[PDB]
Write a protein that binds this ligand. Structure first.
Ligand SMILES: [Cl-]
Ligand SMILES: [Cl-]
Ligand SMILES: [Cl-]
Length: 129
C-alpha cells in the first residue's frame, strides 16, 4: 500500500507513535517519506546481506526474521514480511522498540541525514489529525 501523507500521519497517530519517546508525528512521517516513500511494500538489500522492510525500512540484522540474514536477531519477534502489510501495526510496534534502544531516531540513518533538525511539522501541515 502506498499511503498518502496525511493518511499515514493519521495511522501513525492511531497507533500511538505521535510524540512517542518525544518524537513528534512530523518526525515519523518524514522518516517514512525518505525510507520508503510511504510504500509499505518497500524492501532494500544492504551490503552486509541484511534487508530493510516496510514503511520505516526496519532491518533484519536486529529486528525481524527473514531466514537469510546469518547471525542476526529478531528482537521484534516477527517475520520481516509482517512489516510489508497494508496494516502498519507491526511496523509501528517494532519502531517503538527500535526508537527506545538508546539512540532515538538516529537508528534511522535517513532520519538523521534528511529529517533531523529540519521543519518536520511541514510533513503534517494541513492534515486533519
Ligand atoms: Cl511535527
Ligand atoms: Cl536469518
Ligand atoms: Cl541518508
Amino acid at each position: 500500500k502506498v499511503f498518502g501523507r496525511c493518511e499515514l500521519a493519521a495511522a501513525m497517530k492511531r497507533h500511538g507513535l505521535d510524540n512517542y519517546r518525544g518524537y513528534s508525528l512530523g518526525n515519523w512521517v518524514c522518516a517514512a517519506k525518505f525510507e520508503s516513500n510511504f510504500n509499505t511494500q518497500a524492501t532494500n538489500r544492504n551490503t552486509d546481506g541484511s534487508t530493510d522492510y516496510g514503511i520505516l525500512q526496519i532491518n533484519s540484522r536486529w529486528w525481524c526474521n527473514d531466514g537469510r540474514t546469518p547471525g542476526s536477531r529478531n528482537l521484534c519477534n516477527i517475520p520481516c514480511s509482517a512489516l510489508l502489510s497494508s496494516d502498519i501495526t507491526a511496523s509501528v510496534n517494532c519502531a517503538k522498540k527500535i526508537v527506545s534502544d538508546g539512540n532515538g531516531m538516529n537508528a534511522w540513518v535517513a532520519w538523521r541525514n534528511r529529517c533531523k533538525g529540519t521543519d518536520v511539522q511541514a510533513w503534517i501541515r494541513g492534515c486533519r489529525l
